[PDB]
Amino acid sequence: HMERPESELIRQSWRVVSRSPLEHGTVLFARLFALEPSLLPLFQGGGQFSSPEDSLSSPEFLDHIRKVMLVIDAAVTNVEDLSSLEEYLTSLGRKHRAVGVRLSSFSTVGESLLYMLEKSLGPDFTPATRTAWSRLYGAVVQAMSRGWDG
Ligand code: HEM
Numbered sequence: 001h002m003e004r005p006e007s008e009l010i011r012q013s014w015r016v017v018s019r020s021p022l023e024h025g026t027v028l029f030a031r032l033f034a035l036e037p038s039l040l041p042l043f044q045g046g047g048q049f050s051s052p053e054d055s056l057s058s059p060e061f062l063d064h065i066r067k068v069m070l071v072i073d074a075a076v077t078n079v080e081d082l083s084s085l086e087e088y089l090t091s092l093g094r095k096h097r098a099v100g101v102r103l104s105s106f107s108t109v110g111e112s113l114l115y116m117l118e119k120s121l122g123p124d125f126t127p128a129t130r131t132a133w134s135r136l137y138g139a140v141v142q143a144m145s146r147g148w149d150g
Contacts, residue, residue, distance in 0.1 A: 006132040007079045014076045025065035031112040086143045093147025
């Protein structure tokens, strides 16, 4: 349950972001690392003390930014009803727990998301657009938090 006018604020703004997902994704992660810098070591080359062993164990950053935005894409596609994605999102959450990402970190992503959108859109980031994106992202996180034994 999210109604057409709000779904449409989301579809439109996402269209602008979708012109350049890596560029905007990089803004999201930069804010993210400013807020939680301890997440950096989870990516290939994000360590101060790591060998080339991480390159295969760990995700590469720009590649993973693509994956993040693809998942957000699916959420947008299902903005009006998100239940067909809960299976997946519960599975994705489990993966993030498995490699040491705290649930609390996904809040920091939310802020970073709103920050990216705000930079991306300026006055077009209307209060209703911000609120709707909180609801949408919160719903995504809700589904994902299922993978944390909770
Ligand atoms: C602090 C935030 C985040 C960190 C540190 C992070 C870190 C990682 C890491 C380390 C992996 C590799 C997982 C593995 O192969 O075991 C990964 C995979 C992934 N992440 Fe994230 N992630 C974050 C947020 C997100 C968010 C918000 C999304 C989507 C909404 C996302 C989507 C993905 C996807 C799709 C994969 C691929 C997993 C697969 O192949 O099944 N991540 N993430």
